[PDB]
Amino acid sequence: PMAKLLPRIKKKILAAAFK
Structure with missing residues (x-):
């Protein structure tokens, strides 16, 4: 995902x- 939320x-x- 472009959003860093999931990696975070x-x-x-x-x-x-x-x-």
């Missing part, structure tokens, strides 16, 4: 994975 979500998911 993925990045946040990886961030949430960082425990």
